[PDB]
């Protein structure tokens, strides 16, 4: 359970040395360009208030307006902001879009408030950081706890101060400028760069084994598009329990019955199983889809999988790369696998600063295109740099804001 | 030394259960407004690079815009800063000007950086809040670490973004907007101060011993005014050594020599003394005029002074206060005694937004009312709830900010 | 027969300068103005055809505070006149100690020859083109030659459309609009005021000596007749339709009159006419030019019959003047201190716009006086520090206050 | 050397009169929107400080926002920015972009600053025209004495008042926003304005000679890319020397020499010869690549060349137009020939608002297309009118600009 910022910036202090950074820019790099705390109190329904603190890390905007999402869970607090804020930063530049990194949230427990408070709580933060984020400096997106509603709420709000800006945040619903293909674009993309790693071993999806941590946004688009390019999920946990099957899951009937039960027990093609054992699950590629930090040096040597592709945000330590290292096991990094949320999110801002939307099909060569460049981009890192695919992403992005910075200066 | 966040909300918690405040009311008025913490990087003379992190905690808003100084110290870091910008909110309220509290900082040693490296610091630190500051908004000052020249580099950095904005800072030199009093303001509070408490006695200035602790904007005027109604300066410090002499130093040929030498314990009029004895010098009137949280639980119970008058921002820490009141000790707390500055702060702003500025008799009569109607105010409190100073003060403040907060009122 | 406006002007300059012992880059630094703007202003004439003219704003500094000075219609108002006037109002602003910097603007037009709506619409157009570029906090106009209260009236009412009611931005406003009891008077008023500092220092007043006075304009005339209802004689006058004299003294009421009801000066039955270009050397004890600057200069300085000379125009007398004048014995009062009662009571009138409540005129004219008699203080002063003559007394004043706040603000960027 | 502004204004009154163009419109197309002079002062790298006067002329934005480059020159005066914003408004117009005219400069000499003073001016200049300029209003680009840095320089001070602003400079660094095909383009440009000049002729590049003055970006890509078309460059100059070779210069060596040694002198391949005989020296086509007005009175009846194409601006003035009109020397006129520049920095700025960048085969196609059609049009100009080259695209141009004056109208 190593503390989130701490194990980011080790990654970081890492990939630095690999490229033998400059200290002052190493140091300037770390530092976030502004770190924001705001109250945000709103009245409940019964007219009671409740105050809750609401965080917005703008990490690097040197390659341009920044970019992430914002999470409302409990476990929200400074140190996961900023380590996810940073993690941005890179995944921006590994990816190629013109952002630089920023994350938000609010510790809070979603399911405790009614669809009124979080939509209060949503616009009251959006009055307290309005003046801070924008078109062109910083766009916000969904995270754990939040979606395209929680966005349209930003967008109303945001709009009141600054006139209709649909740009201002991405994954918006579609009925309010959002883009085609982004709902799923996340667990599209871990399927794109889960298909460009196997190719490198000769394999592919149909026929492997996958478990799948997590089914929200990511996590049931994850386990959809494997199962319908013939993956087998065996076994699949969110926050109410765990199901496994050995012949696969039904994932569409797995959602059907989430959505009418509001569990994933109970479920008729599957087996009850102990939530705490479906990290360690027999599996050819193990995909993390909820919290970070959940594979670390206590269990990461019981990981049965061949390959992790982590499609939730920093889900393994640097305890557990090592120890997994030495077992052998392949690791496709976050700060790539995951891409596929905030690439399409740079396609919707395109299509709304352009104020003209794209088809589907488009959208998903586009991300098809972006992921499979990326993935050429960090072979060559690690061939030049003779190190894994998590530094060869890491070195990627570190490179590319450290030239933009350096490009822009440092004078006043 | 008790953390400085935690000392002042133990202050605070008190305060706000004497006056009977809801829970809810507490826990809003703890939080603050919003906390900013940005990147502050800048070549220095020889070009090499230095990064620092500065600050801006906006406590609270309900009275008028934010007010506070900035503070380039080494021990600058958010604890601290978010102390002294909820003592900012409370002072502004005792002494009744419409401001809330805010403070900042930059953890630096001014001594190590050059003028032209300190002036780039302060631009380019005014270029990462200057969308966060403004007249009706937050408008700083000087504290420790920072002067009249430093406000003026803000005021000329701030005034290309937003144009000609005089009173966006106080603290300016008289040229650019400053007002006549305001150097010597918060000494010259200090004084009123004093004489309010102790005519409470029966007593004057005039034949007691004084002891002082730093000797910068706040200390050189405490002494060299109280020195001038009479008062025995008998022992005074700063960072450099301390100096004694039981018969009365010689405030005015001490700050020549000081200003001469750069040190202290070398002047022909006073001996030489240990530092780290000068808080429990025998005294009158022991005066700190530098850090906080100096008078804790290993040395108060060696303090010999009848009165503490806290000029320092939180010199004296909560376990100290509890034994110095066994001891018979009266503490006229920080948020009364060292209002002179923000006081004078405020005339100085208003003379800014009215276009003329006042004499400086004007300035020191409306100060010295300020400060007597401070004092009536706290007694009252006093009585009212059969509570000492500090709480006197705190309870004040407390219920004036509630009391605008509860009328602007909580809806969206 | 003038030397170049901003060579005359930056000669004073350098001299100052040089008393002052000015670092070298500072002195360079103090003279480029802040900013210099040139417009295209073109309108519809009534009958709709195109007229283009070409306005000028110049922001010469800005270190003590909002830039301030008036706008002139004019047809001789070209770059150099309008870098020459900003820069005096600089160094104007500084010597009366008020929170302003300097700037001064312009058109190349001749008003008599426009209709009263091709005027207004040419003020409106100006404005749209520049109201990016001043403000109440940044920079404030005011009337000059050819400008008046109902210019300023049209460039606070379109100015205001791009940025909401917007009092201060412009002063020497009409009373019903915003604008200061006595601003009217107070250029004229300040050089009495100016006058009679300096002549107390001889043990003399205006009563019973005698005044030449160039230009009969806002300046002009208040000029003339606040001298004349001190008892002093006003001897010769000129406008820019002639020269009339009597060496008894011009009853200035009658004239004002006569000038009201047939539009010139000419054929006042109460006194003789002159040539206009003998006027500045017509015999008197003060003569006071009110109108052009540069009338003083190498060709007929040498003629001169005043023993002072009270600068009421914007720099009247170039420096090869002075050293002329300066050799006959005659004083010379600089517009810099003299003819700032304009400027001061234009600041009265933007504290009061800002403060959103406007004074009685015995507190204006109170206030005036206070700020004309420190000012004179000052520059006697540094007169004596420097052993200099009034107009680098002032000139060293002005100059050192700009200075010090250049260097409290610094120069990183 | 004739005045500037005298020869540009000149040739504009003589356009117009060919058009028949109304006075009154005349004289207005003549004053330019607003002419801007601004102190740059800065403090030097051993802090004494050096004052420059920074000049932008936004000549006319009839046809939309104004557009042209920043030169710091020694030379750089009023006159010549005047000058060279009044070409800009013809320019864009006969290349059917949406903008109009500007220029700016700083009177310097670039070669005695170090990088950061040149930043350190570059920033102060941005400083003071920020509100001048914007991504609607006037996007600057290079010129002479300036490059991509000192473009990013320009963005990253201005984005600090208005957020991140890519499209309100061009000739950006690729990785800051840049346009592939921008660096090469004004030299590529050239290149296809010959070719469409020459084929009226039956004639193309290979096998033909040209003599090329300055060897910047606009002369070095120019005689690249003529080399590589076939073209024999048989003589090139900068400010350090003359080099001739009547079999033709190899430019990739020489570009080389020029590189590591910062001389064209002592280059292997290649004779010295006498910088002010290179304008005269023989051969089919004459590129003035440098400073304007070098082609006068004095020089141009000694002109050898066949062909005259402009890649500086107005090298030309028009009393040798008309010497080498008598000689039968046709000239392709600066405002269609080295469009090429102001037409790609078009697409970098569409790039930018967009927020989606151009493969470089799209970019330099649409050069082509632009630079075909404009060629097309000035010839029916030339037809209708009766007119040589200059006046073809002069005329075009200011009847384009007039029609966009006509119907925004004139009423307040
Ligand atoms: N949404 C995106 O576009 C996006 C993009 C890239 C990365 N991510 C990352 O993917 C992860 C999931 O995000 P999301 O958008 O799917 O969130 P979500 O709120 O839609 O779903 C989160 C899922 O995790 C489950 N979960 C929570 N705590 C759990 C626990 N202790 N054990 C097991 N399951 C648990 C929830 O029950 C739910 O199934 C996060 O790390 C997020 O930062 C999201
Ligand atoms: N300046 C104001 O208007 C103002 C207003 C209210 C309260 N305060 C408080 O007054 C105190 C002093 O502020 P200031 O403006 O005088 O600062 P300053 O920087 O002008 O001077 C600080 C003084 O403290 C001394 N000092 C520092 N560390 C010391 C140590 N360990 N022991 C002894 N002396 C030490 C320094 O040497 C110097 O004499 C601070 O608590 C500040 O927050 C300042
Ligand atoms: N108005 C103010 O508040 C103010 C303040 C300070 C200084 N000034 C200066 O005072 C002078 C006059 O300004 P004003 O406001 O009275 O202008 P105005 O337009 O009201 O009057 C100008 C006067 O000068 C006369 N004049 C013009 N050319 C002349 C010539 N060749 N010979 C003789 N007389 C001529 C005109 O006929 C008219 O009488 C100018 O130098 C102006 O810059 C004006
Ligand atoms: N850069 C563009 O995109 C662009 C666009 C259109 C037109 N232009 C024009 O092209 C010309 C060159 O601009 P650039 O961008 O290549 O500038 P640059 O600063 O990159 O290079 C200028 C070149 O001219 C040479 N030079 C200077 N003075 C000279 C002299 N007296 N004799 C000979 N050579 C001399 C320099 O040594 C250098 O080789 C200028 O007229 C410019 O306005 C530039
Ligand atoms: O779409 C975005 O802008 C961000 C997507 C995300 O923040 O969830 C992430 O990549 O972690
Ligand atoms: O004058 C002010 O606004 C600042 C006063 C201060 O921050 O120094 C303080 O009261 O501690
Ligand atoms: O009142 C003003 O602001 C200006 C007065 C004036 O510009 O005419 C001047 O002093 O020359
Ligand atoms: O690319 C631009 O906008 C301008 C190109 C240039 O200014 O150098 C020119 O055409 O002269
Ligand atoms: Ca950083
Ligand atoms: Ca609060
Ligand atoms: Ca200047
Ligand atoms: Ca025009
Ligand atoms: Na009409
Ligand atoms: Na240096």
């Known amino acids: 359970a190593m503390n989130a910022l701490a194990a980011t ?39 009671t208030l409740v ?24 476990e929200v607090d400074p140190d996961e902001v900023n380590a996810l804020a940073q993690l941005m930063t890179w995944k921006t530049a590994v990816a190629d879009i013109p952002y630089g990194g920023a994350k938000g949230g609010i510790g809070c427990s979603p399911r405790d408030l009614s669809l009124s408070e979080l939509e209060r709580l949503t616009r ?17 997106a969904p995270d ?19 006139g209709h800006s649909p740009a201002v945040v991405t994954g918006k619903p579609i009925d309010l400028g959002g883009s085609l293909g982004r709902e799923a674009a996340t667990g599209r993309g871990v399927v794109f760069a889960t298909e460009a790693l196997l190719a490198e ?10 478990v799948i941590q997590g089914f929200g946004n990511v ?12 993956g087998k999920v065996v076994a699949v946990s969110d926050i109410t329990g765990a199901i496994r099957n050995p012949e696969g899951i039904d994932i569409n009937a797995l959602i059907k019955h989430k959505d009418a039960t509001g569990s994933l027990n109970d479920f008729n093609g599957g087996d009850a199983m102990n939530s705490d054992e479906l ?10 889809c909820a ?28 305890d557990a790369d090592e120890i997994l290292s030495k077992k052998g096991v392949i690791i496709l990094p976050d700060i790539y696998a995951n891409a596929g949320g905030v690439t399409v999110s740079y396609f919707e801002w395109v299509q709304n600063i352009q104020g003209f939307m794209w088809e589907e099909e488009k959208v998903n060569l586009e991300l098809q295109k972006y992921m499979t460049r990326a993935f050429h981009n960090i072979k060559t890192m690690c061939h030049t740099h003779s190190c894994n695919l998590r530094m060869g992403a890491f070195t990627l992005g570190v490179n590319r804001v450290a030239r933009a910075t350096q490009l822009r200066g440092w004078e006043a």
């Not at 970081?12 to 109190?41: N, Q, W, Y």
């Not at 754990?144 to 600054?162: C, R």
């Not at 071993?201 to 996958?210: A, D, E, P, R, V």
């Not at 996590?219 to 013939?230: D, N, Q, S, Y």
């Open 9 to 47: 910036n080790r990654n970081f202090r890492h990939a630095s040395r690999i490229l033998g950074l400059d200290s002052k820019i190493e140091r300037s790099l770390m530092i976030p360009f502004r770190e924001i705390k705001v109250e945000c109190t709103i009245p409940k329904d019964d007219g």
């Open 51 to 74: 105050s809750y603190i609401g965080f917005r890390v703008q990490h690097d905007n040197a390659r341009g307006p920044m970019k992430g999402g914002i999470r409302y869970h409990p």
């Open 124 to 140: 009251v933060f959006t009055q307290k950081i309005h003046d801070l984020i924008g078109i062109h400096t910083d766009v916000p």
């Open 144 to 162: 754990m706890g939040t979606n395209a509603q929680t966005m349209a709420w930003i967008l109303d709000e945001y709009s009141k101060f600054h």
């Open 201 to 210: 071993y000769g394999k592919s999806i149909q026929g492997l084994t996958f």
């Open 219 to 230: 996590g049931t688009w994850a386990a959809k598009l494997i199962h319908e390019k013939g």
């Open 279 to 288: 990290l360690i699950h027999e599996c050819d590629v193990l995909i993390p």
């Open 291 to 318: 919290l970070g930090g959940v594979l670390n040096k206590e269990n990461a040597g019981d990981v049965k999988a061949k390959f992790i592709v982590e499609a939730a945000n920093h889900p393994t330590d640097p």
